[PDB]
Amino acid sequence: NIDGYFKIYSKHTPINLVRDLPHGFSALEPLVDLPIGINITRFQTLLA
Amino acid sequence: NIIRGWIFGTTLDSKTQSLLIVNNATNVVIKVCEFQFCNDPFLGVYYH
């Protein structure tokens, strides 16, 4: 979040790796900007 | 597909606004409201 606009950048892998976060290089492309204007101090995940 | 989205905010109880990000079996829904969020938000699926 910056000057009232929230932002999301995202990507996914082609790999089927063994167990832990790999040291390869692949940079995240921008997905969406959102004009939400809210003060955020904390966040939570939603699982199934 | 267990990660479904996120809550972002500060009070998380409709004292002030907060952002809901969710994916369900139809679409990604994005929403800002005076949300009285659950003390443990989730999605649940009856698998098979």
Add this chain to the structure above:
Amino acid sequence: SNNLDSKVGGNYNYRYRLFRKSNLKPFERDISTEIYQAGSTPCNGVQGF
């Protein structure tokens, strides 16, 4: 907007935040209407000294 909205007994629809704890950042918005504490006390309920 006098010629759109000035009422003779004052157009008391409109409202603004008269006091807040601190400065708001650019393009932030705060709707939360809770009581201001000018006295040092942990003020609660609808009013106080």
